[PDB]
């Protein structure tokens, strides 16, 4: 599990925890200040124990190698501007089903929508995760034009 920050934002991509570690996961997650976790890939576990511990879990998927709707970008973008101004110092965890999968793509958007060019964000990310953004994803981010309503 890796982490990346920028301005008021600090994310944490992770690995789809098995039911076999959920108890430990929560402990890890809480040691980072993670308050929310977006699952963008198949859901493989209960959330009651998590939600039990003040950690909401939003479920907004989309097929890897596929642009995350238009709605999903809104919410993500909002969520990111809100949660961070609202909970100073908190982390937001995004996780996929396999491993990184498409999780970086979001974070990227978070960075792009924050005044970073897509490459500036791809590099900034591949700094933590050796290999991410398969050919297709690199295109999506490249084409992506920002709304840019993120105050800092």
């Amino acid at each position: 599990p890796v982490e990346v920050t920028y301005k008021n934002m600090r994310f944490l991509i992770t690995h789809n925890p098995t039911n076999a570690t959920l108890n430990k996961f929560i402990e890890e997650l809480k040691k980072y200040g993670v308050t929310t976790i977006v699952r963008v890939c198949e859901a493989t576990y209960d959330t009651t124990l998590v939600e039990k511990e003040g950690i909401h879990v939003l479920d907004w998927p989309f097929d890897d190698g596929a642009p995350p709707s238009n709605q999903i970008v809104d919410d993500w973008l909002s969520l990111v501007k809100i949660k961070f101004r609202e909970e100073p110092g908190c982390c937001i965890a995004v996780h996929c089903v396999a491993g990184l999968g498409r999780a970086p793509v979001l974070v990227a958007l978070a960075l792009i929508e924050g005044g970073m060019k897509y490459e500036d964000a791809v590099q900034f990310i591949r700094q933590k995760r050796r290999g991410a953004f398969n050919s297709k994803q690199l295109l999506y981010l490249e084409k992506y034009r920002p709304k840019m309503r993120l105050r800092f």
Binding site: A43, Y45, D46, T47, T48, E51, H56, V57, L58, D59, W60, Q71, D75
Partner: peptide, 9 residues
């Protein structure tokens, strides 16, 4: 009797 509910859209 628990599963993963929450979320919104």
């Amino acid at each position: 009797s628990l599963i993963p509910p929450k979320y919104i859209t």
